[PDB]
Structure 1
């Protein structure tokens, strides 16, 4: 019934009772675990009712007059039109809850602090662009980063979706070369090629910021260039290794995810970009060291004069550590908010304890929460986790092309 959850460093035990609230199935069965894989009116009515019940309970007014009447408005709207609409205060609560509920997010200690921009009165791609430019300015705040989400109009039965084609608001281009190598970020070759086809004049650098492709319902997407001054970037240098600055490496300040679906009370928001601040291992380990990304390990190790001929000299491990240190030092120097993996995972353990008290559990995906270097050096490695789907939720959605 209720799974026992143990921490192996400290010997402490808790029981997850929150998983009983899950009404949506994951990919696992008793026959096989798939935890490591990356990917009608009556049903809508009950999702809506549950959500409204969640909202009135959060403001302590459960059972009040305002509660009963709001339930009746929703019922009347769905019965007549097949759908309904959220009040701004309900949207705000719903967005925070979807963050709180996200099992892959190590940053959830911050869940209560989220600026929510209501963009549901948007009727064109041009208006979308203005809203996005305002989000970026707010979120960036000259390096003193603030968590934010902007919510565009919900999906509707009659028509096509509002969509941002880009997976993040800020990404670097990937240019496929004559010889089948890539200049820039190999993760972005396909979106880069789409941008060119839709009329963008491409650069030829390793760190060219991509334009946005924004789609209003049932229209071809439109191209918008981000004003250079809005996109804060950090040149990478190393505290003791002088030649590192000459590698010419940089990363953008703002991690801003733009391709996920936000589901609240049965309603679905197909464009709802959100942003926080980076955990340094995302940049230092994954973006720069992954073999299928910028893949810089070998170059850094040679500058460091390490023996690259054999794996047993641990040259990959040594180079990776220095790159991560360069990221942390450079962000700190440029006064841009960042968190290291030790500090982030310590705050996550506190979030786990807060949530055990508040709700009797916390859905968490161990493979995503444990950092990609120095796993067992962090307290989360030794912590058992239960993974399940609660709503409101963020959900992956297929690329619109």
Structure 2
């Protein structure tokens, strides 16, 4: 029983959902870690986590206690006694993936949480199979431009030495090349991964927007390279609806944001390979990818073309050029009928999602630090929205980058 207030509306929501959290958020009563990106770090161990999810699943359909429930427990309980684990019924698999997304406190997009396509890839055994499932995921999810949310779930962690992992952080990312002069070409955030792919035999075309290969690890084996068919990689070239010099900037971005490095936790099961894809919020590309200094850093480039007074910072030349960039992104995706959402709509829809969640569910964990868009913050409704943040399962956790943890054969 905890209240959260919206200061712009004076609307007030009561939160009971948080009482059903059990994972430490990293904060204590003495020190908040709300801006820390990574705050926290057998039989009588896995069955509790399994028992809880199944209990939770049958509650979402009122079969709480019914003989299937009581039997599912014993079925799961004895699978652990022999096979040291258990497998999720298809329904449970789809419920858990939709509910890791429902519980993603950092995701502004969760108004769509129940509209999730779940591709079960738990029979997969090789990287070539991993490539096939992902190729199908990307095609389905891209859908000619009318994007659809989707997750593909590979076999669960079995012993750690047989993890399925997508080594790319995202299914679709541009390469990053260290330069002779010491600078960088392409996406700098990816230089390390690009160098891994080159070391692994990828032939870099050494351009600004080179689509990285899929680096796929199945059953703990060494990873393997695959080039996604380019006809599956929808890209949008960035032009501006006013500045006709903007296309001259040579900018483009891919259309499909697809997170492949996170871990999906259902009932004590760890799916170390579970790429999930949505559609972009415009700011992600226009603010973070294009303007972050550690990224494509086009701010200075745009202002030069914009005539702005880059003398002093109080001219706000960065802010002005920033807005124009994000106009050009939103307008380029919509000109190509590729799904995209601006931060105004997306935050507005998230306010409504919060209302919905407090009403039907009694709460909705949200990370204000991540929900508020990286530009124009206070002119969006989530800025004025108090948010409780807490960790419900099923969930997407982070996990160590595989190369830091993989013994090569």
Shorter-chain TM-score bucket reads: over 0.9
Structure 1, residues 102-154: CA drift from partner, whole Å, max 9, x if none?
00000000001011001100111111101110001100000010000000000
Alignment partner, residue 406 of structure 2: none
**Once the 2 structures are TM-superposed, how far is the Cα of residue 44 of structure 1 from its aligned partner?**
1.2
Cα separation, 2, equivalents of 1:139 and 1:38: 28
Identify the residue that residue 29 of structure 2 maps to in structure 1: 30
C-alpha separation in 1, matches of 2:161 and 2:241? 54
Aligned to 2:249: 247
Shift of 1:59: 2.0
Aligned residues: 400
Of 166, 169, 191, 1:167 maps to 169
| Matching residue within 317, 325, 328 for 1:326 | 328
The corresponding residue for 1:133 is 135
Structural RMSD (CA): 1.0
Cα distance in structure 2, aligned partners of 1:229 and 1:32? 50
Superposed CA deviations along residues 206-232 of structure 1, whole A, max 9, x for unmatched, are 001001111122321111111111100
Is the deviation greater in 216-225 or in 271-280?
A: 216-225
Secondary structure of the equivalent of 1:91?
A: helix
Q: Does 1:13 align with 2:15?
A: no
What secondary structure does 1:291 align onto?
Answer: coil
Runs of 5+ unmatched residues, structure 2: 404-409
Query: Secondary structure of 1:15's match?
Result: strand
Structure-1-length-normalised TM-score: 0.98
Q: C-alpha deviations, 1:291-329, integer Å up to 9, x for none?
A: 110000111011111110011111111100000000011
**In 2, Cα distance between the equivalents of 1:400 and 1:159?**
11
Q: Distance in 2 between matches of 1:26 and 1:311?
A: 37
Range with bigger deviation, 9-18 or 360-369: 9-18
Report if the CA contact (8 A) 2:240-2:332 is conserved: yes
SS of equivalent residue, structure 2 residue 246: helix
In 1, are the aligned partners of 2:160 and 2:220 still within 8 Å (CA)? no
How far apart, in 2, do the equivalents of 1:97 and 1:158 lie?
Answer: 24
Instruction: Quote the Cα distance in structure 1 between the aligned partners of 2:138 and 2:13.
Output: 40
The equivalent of 1:150 in structure 2 is: 152
Cα-to-partner distance string for 1:154-210 (whole Å, 9 max, x where unaligned): 011273211111000000000000111000010000000000111111112100100
2:124 aligns to what? 122
Question: Where does the alignment leave 5 or more consecutive residues of structure 1 unmatched?
Answer: none
TM-fit CA distance, 1:61: 2.0
User: 1:342 pairs with 344, 351, 354, which one?
Assistant: 344
Report the 3-state secondary structure (helix = DSSP H, G, I; strand = E; otherwise coil) of the residue aligned with 1:243: coil
Deviation of 1:43 after TM superposition, in Å, equals: 2.5
Q: For each residue in 1:214-257, what CA deviation from the matched residue of structure 2 results, as whole angstroms up to 9, or x when unmatched? A: 11223211111111111000011100111001111000000000
1:328-352 CA-to-partner distances (Å, cap 9, x unmatched) read 1100001100000000000000000
CA distance in structure 2 between the partners assigned to 1:63 and 1:146 by the alignment = 35
Aligned match of 1:42: 44
The whole-number CA distance in structure 2 between the counterparts of 1:152 and 1:61 is 28
Corresponding residue number in structure 1 for 2:216: 214
In structure 1, C-alpha distance between the alignment counterparts of 2:242 and 2:199, rounded to whole Å: 44
TM-score between the two structures when normalised by the length of structure 2:
0.96
Q: Which one of the candidate residues 254, 257, 260 is aligned to 1:258?
A: 260
Q: How does 1:177-326 map to 2 (within 5 A)?
A: 177-326=179-328
How far residue 99 of structure 1 moved from its aligned partner, in angstroms, is 0.1
Displacement after TM superposition at 1:58 (Å): 1.4
**Counterparts of 1:158 and 1:6 in 2: how far apart (Å)?**
44
User: What is the CA–CA distance in structure 1 between the aligned matches of 2:336 and 2:277, rounded to whole Å?
Assistant: 19
**Secondary structure at the residue paired with 1:219?**
coil
Contact 2:286–2:325, Cα closer than 8 Å, also in 1: yes
Q: Tell me, in whole angstroms, the C-alpha distance in 2 between the residues paired with 1:12 and 1:220.
A: 53
2:152 aligned counterpart, secondary structure: strand
Q: Which of residues 357, 364, 367 in structure 2 aligns to 1:365? A: 367
